[PDB]
Design a protein around this ligand. Structure first.
Ligand SMILES: CCCCCCCCOCCOCCOCCOCCO
Ligand SMILES: CCCCCCCCOCCOCCOCCOCCO
Ligand SMILES: CCCCCCCCOCCOCCOCCOCCO
Ligand SMILES: CCCCCCCCOCCOCCOCCOCCO
Ligand SMILES: CCCCCCCCOCCOCCOCCOCCO
Ligand SMILES: CCCCCCCCOCCOCCOCCOCCO
Ligand SMILES: [Mg+2]
Length: 544
């Protein structure tokens, strides 16, 4: 029930005035997930289209927004993937590193800067769970996974985690190494060192290497909270022949204090990107931002706010803000209103590529949102409507020879969610409606399901832990490339069911079973790229 992402500090969800979702490891081990897209598609407002199976290019669309309009943080610390030019993928990101996910929807550019429009996904790779764990998997598609993890001090003050994981099929191979050091100076002062890298091979061949190093100091006291954090990432993406290399440096400093019935915060955020020539000659992009945040509770009312100023070495200064008010009109029920502003920064290609253009400005969004949330007869629910006007979109004029700012996009959506228990059954449902169009031409965007329905259902029989997940992906427009000109089609969307089971044998030695695409239904999220739907996975874990 504690989440950071929102304001960079620990706080209760019931305190965040905006929809959010949290995923813990335990969930991920239940769902038996081998892919970050597997753990994301299950959540509200999210749809992921992939040109095939694991390893393949995927794009994430949050609440009908474009593929690069979501912010992926890794303890964030954004996702070592400026792109390389320029949006987040997560196809090649090792599920083994994921210990938790916090996801918040709506704009948060006013804390994080450029990139937060529609959503923020914060993939965290830290944990507090001592003991060593050796696991493995064998599935039905040449899938073979082995993993070993451990966390133990070493000190009584310092603690060390080490994990190595290996996953390939037969063509996608991933190898991953992670080590960490957590030292507590006092009962309030703490620090860490983090290093990790993965080397992936994806069959034309692709070879990507990444490595990340993070170091940080934190202070959490009775009233005052502060963090100083430092990150450097190095990715090399060899395609074949091309190479993309990006080096990313980050330094940020924030503070927060408990002033009354909430807090007030502020920090400074600096980022440097070194992109190598032919990557995407070479560019060095620099961005610095400054922001302030605030949460105040006053009698049945809630107020949460952030505002930021970014100075960007190519477009200069851009400012950003957001505000929410919550009203608990009767115990258990709340009405909530939010408004927010956000931006996406021009990327290397759009800026300095074959086509223009070095003077582009950021794509800008405004978002308004209304919501009712409640606890009723044991059901925790929420329903929101939102409207998102995006403008100064960067397009390709088709004529001169360059990118410019021109198109607009309206989005109107609705999200509803509920979780509740009946028997020994737990239910977790959501519905989404995304009406995303081109505001000028008034045609549906493309690649976005107009409706999604998600249902999860968990229950224990007899020491057998069962879980069933159901998804309806609605109708999307895409393009029939096969023939030029490429025109648009309509895929009808479909239903998928997955079934996962788990048995605790003895104590440290759980055996797990999964069946994806229960009915072995054939469908595509991206026109032309066949999905792989009929896999049996069998897996285990031993703890000691
Ligand atoms: C001390 C600064 C207060 C919040 C800074 C960022 C807010 C910018 O717009 C939000 C305020 O505009 C409407 C009023 O809402 C303010 C409530 O936010 C919490 C203040 O503690
Ligand atoms: C922490 C609170 C500060 C956030 C408030 C920002 C809201 C913007 O205020 C009014 C906006 O009007 C400014 C734009 O006016 C002209 C637009 O471009 C021309 C430059 O002046
Ligand atoms: C402690 C840092 C305070 C930062 C507050 C502003 C961050 C972004 O500002 C909100 C953007 O709204 C308008 C501000 O930018 C407009 C720039 O024009 C100002 C001179 O005309
Ligand atoms: C759009 C939001 C809808 C808000 C409707 C809620 C308004 C009233 O909420 C229900 C009031 O509580 C009724 C439950 O009855 C009391 C239950 O306690 C059991 C013993 O007293
Ligand atoms: C107050 C929460 C509403 C969320 C959807 C349920 C209400 C539907 O009532 C009328 C539907 O609105 C007509 C078109 O809906 C699309 C608008 O989506 C939200 C952005 O305006
Ligand atoms: C939603 C109608 C007004 C009362 C909302 C109750 C809470 C809804 O929880 C629903 C969980 O997901 C299923 C919702 O499906 C119906 C809502 O769809 C709105 C249509 O635009
Ligand atoms: Mg002409």
């Amino acid at each position: 029930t504690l989440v950071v992402t929102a304001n960079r500090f620990e706080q209760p969800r019931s305190t965040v005035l905006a929809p959010t979702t949290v995923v813990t490891r335990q969930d991920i081990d239940r769902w038996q997930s081998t892919s970050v897209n597997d753990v994301l598609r299950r959540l509200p407002g999210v749809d992921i289209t992939q040109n095939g199976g694991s390893g393949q290019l995927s794009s994430i669309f949050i609440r009908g927004t474009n593929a690069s309009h979501v912010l992926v943080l890794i303890d964030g610390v954004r996702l070592n993937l400026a792109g390389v030019s320029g949006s987040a993928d997560l196809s090649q990101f090792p599920i083994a590193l994921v210990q938790r996910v916090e996801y918040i929807r709506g704009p948060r550019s006013a804390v994080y800067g450029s990139d937060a429009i529609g959503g923020v996904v914060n993939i965290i790779t830290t944990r507090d769970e001592p003991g060593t764990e050796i696991s493995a998997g064998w599935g039905s598609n040449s899938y073979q996974n082995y993993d070993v993890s451990t966390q133990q001090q070493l000190g009584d003050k310092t603690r060390v985690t080490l994990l190595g994981d290996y996953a390939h099929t037969h063509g996608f191979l991933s190898k991953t190494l992670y080590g960490a050091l957590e030292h507590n100076f006092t009962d309030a002062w703490s620090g860490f060192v983090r290093g990790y890298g993965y080397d992936n091979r994806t069959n034309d061949t692709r070879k990507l290497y990444s490595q990340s190093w993070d170091a940080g100091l934190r202070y959490n006291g009775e009233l005052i909270k502060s963090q100083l954090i430092t990150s450097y990432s190095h990715s090399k993406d060899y395609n074949y022949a091309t190479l993309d290399e990006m080096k990313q440096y980050t330094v940020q400093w924030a503070n927060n204090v408990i002033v009354g019935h909430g807090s007030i915060g502020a920090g400074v955020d600096m980022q440097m990107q070194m992109t190598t020539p032919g990557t995407g000659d070479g560019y060095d992009q620099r961005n610095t931002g400054i922001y302030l945040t605030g949460l105040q509770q006053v009698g049945d009312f809630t107020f949460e706010g952030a505002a930021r100023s970014d100075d960007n070495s190519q477009f200069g200064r851009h400012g950003t803000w957001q505000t929410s008010a919550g009203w608990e009109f009767i115990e258990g029920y709340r009405f909530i209103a939010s408004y927010g502003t956000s931006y996406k920064a021009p990327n290397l290609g759009q800026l300095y590529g074959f086509y223009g253009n070095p003077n582009l400005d950021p794509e800008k969004s405004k978002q308004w949102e209304g919501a009712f949330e409640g606890l009723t007869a044991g059901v925790n629910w929420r329903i929101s409507g939102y409207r998102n006007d995006v403008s100064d979109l960067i397009d390709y004029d088709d004529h001169t020879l360059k990118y410019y700012n021109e198109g607009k996009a309206r989005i109107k959506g609705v999200e509803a969610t509920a979780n509740f228990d009946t028997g020994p059954l737990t239910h977790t449902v959501s519905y989404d409606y995304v009406d995303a169009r081109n505001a000028i031409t008034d045609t549906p965007l493309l690649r976005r399901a107009k409706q999604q329905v998600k249902y999860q259902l968990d229950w224990q029989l007899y020491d057998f832990d069962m879980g069933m997940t159901m998804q309806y992906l609605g109708t999307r427009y895409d393009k029939d490339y096969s023939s030029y000109p490429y025109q648009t089609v309509k895929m009808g969307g479909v239903s998928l069911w997955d079934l996962a089971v788990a048995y605790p044998v003895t104590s440290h030695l759980t055996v797990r079973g999964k069946i994806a695409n229960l009915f072995d239904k054939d469908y595509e999220t991206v026109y032309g790229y066949q999905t792989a739907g009929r896999e049996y996975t069998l897996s285990g874990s031993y703890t000691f």
